[PDB]
């Protein structure tokens, strides 16, 4: 009876509002979908505990009073980016980059699993770890290799699921992500491709760049609020470094600058084996001649060979892949970037 009276006390065409701020005096400020902001009153059955600046409520047409709080799948944008399942092969997938493995193991696993080296002496663990170098030098493969061998949760951010146009959704998901990093295990914040948001620190007069500079400043603020973080590890990765934010390269925030130099033909032979593993590799093919001839090719190129080797088998209606397919895939696919070398001059 009483539930039906209050459900019929408000108006029926309830309008979807937007909270902006809260004053604790039975009224608040809200925002319509057209951006018109209305100094309206709030009721008392509205369950004043979940009211947060940035949520949505229900409004009236007559007085636009706050009818009730609105759910929004509670956060659709921090539960998608969280990894639940297992990544790729742990340590045997990569090869030749074992110089940098001691860096990332002692900076991540050693503050967590054995936090006694830091207590015998009194040396604090590092927070920021930067991965830069050539474009596609094996930064994605390395980040999944470290995240497999873990005992804590892991976070995977694309970098383009951070910038919206709602003027508050930028700095909102920073607190949404770090709360998930706080409520769960001391996870690894992996926000990939931070170069599109953080560069050169420019301020303009339009309403296009203002959603970037605040969110850049609020993330730098929320990373180093210096109140209680609970040993959050942050891995940041871009390709380039020279058009990036200089005040994150300075000490006090990040003291690890890990570079990934170019590999050799030694690391290739596993990558040829790994890519030619989940296929019908016939026993009449040769891969070692394909390694010896070509002297510049990456993991994307070998995978582009393996798909072209897979396509040529399906054209003439076969199941396995013959050796001439691998030869013709080596001579068709790999002829796109071979340009520029000083041969016959150097010794």
């Amino acid at each position: 009876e009483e539930r039906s009276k209050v459900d019929d006390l408000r108006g029926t065409p309830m309008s979807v509002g937007t909270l902006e701020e809260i004053i604790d005096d039975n009224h608040a400020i809200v925002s319509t979908s057209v951006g018109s902001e209305h100094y309206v009153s709030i009721l008392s059955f509205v369950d004043k505990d979940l009211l947060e600046p940035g949520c949505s409520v229900l409004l009236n047409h007559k007085v636009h009073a706050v009818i009730g709080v609105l759910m929004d799948d509670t956060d659709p944008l921090v539960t998608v980016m969280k990894v639940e399942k297992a990544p790729q092969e742990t340590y045997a997938d990569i090869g030749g980059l074992d110089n940098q493995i001691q860096e990332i193991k002692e900076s991540v696993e050693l503050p967590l699993t054995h936090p006694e080296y830091y207590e015998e002496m009194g040396i604090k663990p590092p927070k920021g770890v930067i991965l830069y170098g050539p474009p596609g030098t094996g930064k994605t493969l390395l980040a999944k290799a470290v995240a497999n061998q873990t005992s804590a949760t892991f976070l995977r951010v694309v970098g383009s699921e951070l910038i919206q146009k709602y003027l508050g959704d930028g700095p909102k998901l920073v607190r949404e992500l770090f709360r998930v990093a706080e409520e769960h295990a001391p996870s690894i914040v992996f926000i990939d491709e931070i170069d599109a948001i953080g560069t050169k620190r420019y301020d303009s007069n339009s309403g296009g760049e203002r959603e970037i500079q605040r969110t850049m400043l609020e993330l730098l603020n929320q990373l180093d609020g210096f109140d209680s973080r609970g040993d959050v590890k942050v891995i940041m990765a871009t390709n380039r470094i020279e058009t990036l934010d200089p005040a994150l390269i300075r000490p006090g925030r990040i003291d690890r600058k890990i570079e990934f130099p170019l590999p050799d033909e030694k690391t290739k032979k596993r990558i040829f084996q790994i890519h030619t593993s989940r296929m019908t590799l016939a026993d009449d093919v040769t891969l070692d001649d394909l390694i010896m001839a070509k002297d510049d090719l990456s993991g994307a190129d070998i995978k582009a060979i393996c798909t072209e080797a897979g396509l040529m088998a399906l054209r003439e209606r076969r199941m396995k892949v013959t050796n001439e397919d691998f030869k013709k895939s080596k001579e068709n696919v790999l002829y796109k970037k071979q340009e520029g070398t000083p041969e016959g001059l150097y010794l």
Binding site: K165, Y202, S206, G208, K303, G310, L314
Partner: protein, 298 residues
């Protein structure tokens, strides 16, 4: 129901009726509805590129069990580039003619409508219509305009077509790997546009278009001279041999100038000499034939 429309009252805001005919505004550019515009044989020469397109569109659709039996997926990104355009439009219409399939044509400037969000809204409303009819091919045109390079914010950049471009990368890959939908991308000069979608994770096929050869120039010349009136004692091969690496587009230009010279004599007959003056007129290059620029460098 997904993307369902309703009839809504205007005063009480109550439902009136479920609407049929799912959301697709501005389908005048789409659903071309007329198949006969060009036949198949009127291209000639470039016969390898036809078999690459027939087996990347009709072969995954008509015979999907060939590709679903190996263990790899099907390609869905096709890039086409030719810097003078040695057949880009004519090749697509003959595919659109001889397919028996629904076709979608998308011009590359119609997403910037007036103001913010609106051109970004019609992206998701477009491909659901191509998902509504699973036999459908989407054809882009001059993607040089739509997406060049991710610049900075509002200072020295647009930062508005970035909002629409970011959807197109995400609408085909990232939420659900779509099926039975093949896009065709046709623009030349591949340095202006972004290379982010040019990775093999998105585009599996990059078919170039070379300038035609001597037999290829000869066969296009026989197509355009087929509807014309010819006099005996003429050699079409030498006309192709007087074209040092032509474009194929100027095969029309020879056949226009030859018939126009026969027009001003009120004569339906044409000699080889009329074609020889037609080729030499179009061959206006800034080559500086002093026999001293190409001749100090033997």
């Amino acid at each position: 129901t997904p993307n369902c429309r309703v009839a809504l009252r205007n005063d009480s805001y109550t439902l009136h009726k479920i609407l049929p005919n799912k959301v697709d505004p501005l389908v005048s550019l789409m659903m071309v509805e007329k198949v006969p515009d060009s036949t198949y044989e009127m291209i000639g020469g470039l016969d390898k590129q036809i078999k690459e397109i027939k087996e990347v569109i009709e072969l995954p659709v008509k015979h999907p069990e060939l590709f679903e039996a190996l263990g790899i997926a099907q390609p869905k990104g096709v890039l086409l580039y030719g810097p003078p355009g040695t057949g880009k439009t004519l090749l697509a219409r003959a595919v659109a003619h001889h397919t028996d399939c629904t076709f979608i044509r998308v011009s590359g400037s119609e997403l910037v409508q007036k103001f913010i969000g609106e051109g970004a809204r019609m992206v998701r409303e477009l491909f659901v219509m191509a998902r509504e009819h699973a036999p459908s091919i989407i054809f882009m045109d001059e993607i040089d305009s739509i997406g060049s390079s991710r610049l900075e914010g509002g200072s020295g950049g647009d930062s508005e077509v970035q909002r629409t471009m970011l959807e197109l990368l995400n609408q085909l890959d990232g939420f659900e790997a779509t099926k039975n939908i093949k896009v065709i991308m046709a623009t030349n000069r591949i340095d202006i546009l972004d290379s982010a979608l040019l990775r093999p994770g998105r585009i599996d096929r990059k078919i170039e278009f070379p300038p035609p050869n001597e037999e290829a120039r000869l066969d296009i010349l026989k197509i355009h001279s087929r509807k014309m009136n010819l006099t005996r004692g003429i050699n079409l091969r030498k006309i192709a041999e007087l074209m040092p690496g032509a474009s194929g587009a100027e095969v029309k230009g020879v056949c226009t100038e030859a018939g126009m010279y026969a027009l001003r004599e009120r004569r339906v007959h044409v000699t080889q000499e009329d074609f020889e003056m037609a080729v030499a007129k179009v061959m206006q290059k800034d080559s500086e034939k002093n026999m001293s620029i190409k001749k100090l460098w033997k």
